[PDB]
Symmetry: C3
Subunit: 345 residues, 3 copies
Amino acid sequence: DLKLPRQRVDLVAPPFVHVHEQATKQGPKIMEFKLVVQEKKMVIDEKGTTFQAMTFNGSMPGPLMVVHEGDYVEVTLVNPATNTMPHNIDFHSATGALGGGALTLINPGEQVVLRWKATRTGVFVYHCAPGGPMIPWHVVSGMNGAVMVLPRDGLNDGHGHSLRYDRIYYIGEQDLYVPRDEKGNFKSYDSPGEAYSDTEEVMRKLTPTHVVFNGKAGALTGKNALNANVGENVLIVHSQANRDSRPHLIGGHGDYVWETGKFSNAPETGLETWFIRGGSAGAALYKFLQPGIYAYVTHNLIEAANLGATAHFKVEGKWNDDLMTQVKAPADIPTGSTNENLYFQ
Amino acid sequence: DLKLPRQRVDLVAPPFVHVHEQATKQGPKIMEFKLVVQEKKMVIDEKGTTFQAMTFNGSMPGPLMVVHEGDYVEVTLVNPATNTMPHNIDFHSATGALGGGALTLINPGEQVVLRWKATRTGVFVYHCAPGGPMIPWHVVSGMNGAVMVLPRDGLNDGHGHSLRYDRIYYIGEQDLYVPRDEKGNFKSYDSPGEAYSDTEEVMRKLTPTHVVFNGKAGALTGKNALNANVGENVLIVHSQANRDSRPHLIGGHGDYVWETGKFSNAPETGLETWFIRGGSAGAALYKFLQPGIYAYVTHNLIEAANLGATAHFKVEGKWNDDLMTQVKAPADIPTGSTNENLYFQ
Amino acid sequence: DLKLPRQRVDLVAPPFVHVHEQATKQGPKIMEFKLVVQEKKMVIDEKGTTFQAMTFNGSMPGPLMVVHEGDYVEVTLVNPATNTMPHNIDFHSATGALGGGALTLINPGEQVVLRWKATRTGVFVYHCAPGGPMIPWHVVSGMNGAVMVLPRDGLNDGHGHSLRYDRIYYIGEQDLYVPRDEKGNFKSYDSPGEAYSDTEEVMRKLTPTHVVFNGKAGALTGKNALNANVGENVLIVHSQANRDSRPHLIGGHGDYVWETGKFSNAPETGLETWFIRGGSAGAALYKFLQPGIYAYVTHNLIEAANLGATAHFKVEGKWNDDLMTQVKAPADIPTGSTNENLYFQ
Ligand SMILES: OC[C@H]1O[C@@](CO)(O[C@H]2O[C@H](CO)[C@@H](O)[C@H](O)[C@H]2O)[C@@H](O)[C@@H]1O
Ligand SMILES: OC[C@H]1O[C@@](CO)(O[C@H]2O[C@H](CO)[C@@H](O)[C@H](O)[C@H]2O)[C@@H](O)[C@@H]1O
Ligand SMILES: OC[C@H]1O[C@@](CO)(O[C@H]2O[C@H](CO)[C@@H](O)[C@H](O)[C@H]2O)[C@@H](O)[C@@H]1O
Ligand SMILES: OC[C@H]1O[C@@](CO)(O[C@H]2O[C@H](CO)[C@@H](O)[C@H](O)[C@H]2O)[C@@H](O)[C@@H]1O
Ligand SMILES: OC[C@H]1O[C@@](CO)(O[C@H]2O[C@H](CO)[C@@H](O)[C@H](O)[C@H]2O)[C@@H](O)[C@@H]1O
Ligand SMILES: OC[C@H]1O[C@@](CO)(O[C@H]2O[C@H](CO)[C@@H](O)[C@H](O)[C@H]2O)[C@@H](O)[C@@H]1O
Ligand SMILES: O=N[O-]
Ligand SMILES: O=N[O-]
Ligand SMILES: O=N[O-]
Ligand SMILES: [Cu+2]
Ligand SMILES: [Cu+2]
Ligand SMILES: [Cu+2]
Ligand SMILES: [Cu+2]
Ligand SMILES: [Cu+2]
Ligand SMILES: [Cu+2]
């Protein structure tokens, strides 16, 4: 008796995002999505450490879903019989039944269909939440993604001006809790159930062993750097389902930032570093002004450099010497400025 | 020579709140409160772990005090002779003398009377702060609560519209640092002074053993779930005197959120998760739209599920299938969608 | 071919700030600064613990630089041949080349000259970032400071009213990771290179051993308390290059707070406690209303009291009994209020 047109969406693997309109003249639709749970061993760092991951659609994070305010979102959640555990889904975008968790619990060999109305604009976390201690364990094993609910007129600056992005990337940040043996080496297991007891002990001390973007250390560096061009406005959606993060674009800014992630609120302008509260998604727009490599980090630099939480942008274009220039390349310290140099000595 | 009418307030135990007006036509009053310090052993988790608590009025958190802008707050602080330590009180709502700490130090067998003018609107932490290392130790032993200073016209949305709550709950979140023996079992002591040295060692590593609402794991679940009804606007005041928190209402939202807690600032709209900075109180309004169980957590889900930080709301009313429905209950995965399902495989 | 007037600035050691105008009728200038790297052993706590620090200009934090929107900032970075490591500088205020890091790498015996345009208003972190794991290690060894880019019309309240400070202080907060031996005693080293391996192990567990203002526990207490007078509007700039903080002025407030630190955004009013995201600077204005000692802390009170993170203000002036008074000094609890006292018993 919901009498609206239906539109299948084909999801794509992060950090990319399925095709969508920003501003739309379409009316409300039933937007149809499918998520398939996959339990699998995955490589999470550059030394080849593995862990028993649980995922939506085989990725950490799960894929970004994009709809408009007033759409209905009809999600088929599938739990293949090759899986070992029950799973469900909780949309922070949705109203009632623990975000849908209380209507989507499925055993291996089952699927369920949930519909929720997109009444709240912004970027939102979705995650598995089967009950009790299994809630944090499924989330920190990788069962979390995000959904974006755009206003039908697209983004604005909170002051009556339209904002349009040229490109969008979804950065899902994952805190991982990998057990170690007595010598400090990471431990391997043959199933998620076998890893559980040792993993819960690490989780209880609230200190991750790894903090990664797109599921592994180095996943968005080198060959898999994020592309952009000088002049492009880029939307960077950042989610963290369990733990705080402080995003920073090294050599850039957040031109417009919704750090609490909700487009009914005006964005902040010109941030250096923003804050994604654990259990949320946020978003930053930036118009690139300079070519070159840009690191995108959480600005706990220990987590960024030593636990896995660095992505790169490779930006093509021409250098602007008015914004920044090397006036003098590295040279020998004269003599002759010794007394000057002071001085604190 | 302060020539105003006096009004006694009788405090009640959290999560409930003493009777008060939102909007008032009363002028400034001297609002009279009494807090009695109680040192006592308390049960803090579902396994019956005890710890040597220090409290205002026998509860963690201490009770919520409610006054209006321009009121004077006259607090009698009592330290019974059955107590073993000195105590005092610091109101983050108050101006001068370290929030009142420097005027309220009392030994067992003494009481003191402090008056502060409510010049700043919002929700604010109060806590004990006797000096030096005793400041964190008294606070993380449970000596903290909150005070709400309402505007005389009540709450508003920052855009000229009145906001009224039907119900108010005060959620005090407490980080606890319980010593363990060599086998990992929690240790018991005969007095707070005996527990101190071992507790300070845990405190120094900044990782709590427990994170609890209303003083213990499970304190606001089951029989003591928070009641509401569909259509009610509920104000949820959240305080944390020592450590950050990220509140989330599972299956709901924050319709209007003052996460820094101060009603001179417009609230944010439609949040999924908000952020209570350690040493502050914040507040969220929500109008319930769906019946059923709602979990209220800090969205570090490890802390929520495994260290004690989950409350429940039980909401009566009729389900709205337009907002959310189970389109198809759990069923067998057909065959026939195998190739479809993809695909990431 | 940049055809503007040049103005040398002489930096001063924090928490003080070089002379500058708030509002200015000067046009854009090339503002010339010099920073000299100094590696040196420094005392970081009241027990005389030492560590192998790395600094800009011999201080933690490095000094505050102040310029106006549209100025060009020309920084000579010097790495004396007595140093052992390469260094560079990344301005979060600057656009391109990793904030300048990619144009300023210098070996001992070298200097480099970088120019960046001050296109973004606010307070911003600067820090060393030589590459890879050396980025967090140089930052948490003390190589970080801040730059303030004022609007040419000075500060405003976001609602068309000018804000002017009488005094400015720069509080740089530093998380330190000092290795311990098997007995728990802090370890000493003859060089930063010798300290590195043991320090990286502490860094990896994300729990600092010390959290200090102006480079050491007690650095802004006693003789070095910050001075003010009743009626003065004081700007308190707070930076943290690697880790979150939650500033609080005990017995005061933040009258106007830019916790994300960027003056294109209206400040929040009347905060109790604010939040400096790791990798950022923020700023709070406060007009002192009461004389006496004020503690300024991070409101993790364990970090404030037990790990080093307390500063003091000593404020001269006359006490205002309307704002706060001790109605009755500590006295014997009567008898006769026993039944009253209740009650929770
Ligand atoms: O009381 C609401 C509670 O029930 C759930 C089932 O988990 O949703 C249902 O609500 C009613 C059952 O008592 C029915 O009217 C409805 O058919 C059903 O979806 C939860 O969503 C909610 O928490
Ligand atoms: O971190 C403890 C200790 O363990 C060792 C191996 O015994 O390294 C492990 O931990 C390192 C830090 O996480 C990893 O780099 C490595 O993959 C892992 O085996 C030691 O090298 C280290 O001292
Ligand atoms: O200098 C203010 C300082 O004193 C206190 C006492 O702890 O308040 C007092 O201030 C004056 C004492 O020098 C008196 O005028 C007043 O009677 C008294 O309350 C503190 O509140 C403050 O930090
Ligand atoms: O956590 C360490 C280790 O200690 C034991 C008892 O030896 O359990 C203790 O710690 C648990 C986690 O906090 C608690 O659930 C329990 O109350 C406590 O005794 C072991 O069971 C555990 O492996
Ligand atoms: O592609 C930009 C990249 O180069 C740097 C050098 O580290 O800046 C340079 O940019 C160009 C070199 O390809 C030149 O036009 C320019 O002379 C030079 O400064 C970085 O700043 C940037 O990341
Ligand atoms: O904290 C561990 C343990 O080590 C000792 C010395 O063995 O103290 C060290 O650690 C203390 C806390 O950081 C410091 O106060 C002191 O400078 C340091 O030597 C013990 O006293 C303590 O139990
Ligand atoms: O400038 N960021 O590390
Ligand atoms: O949806 N919260 O765990
Ligand atoms: O009131 N601050 O600890
Ligand atoms: Cu799951
Ligand atoms: Cu959630
Ligand atoms: Cu006390
Ligand atoms: Cu306080
Ligand atoms: Cu360096
Ligand atoms: Cu940086």
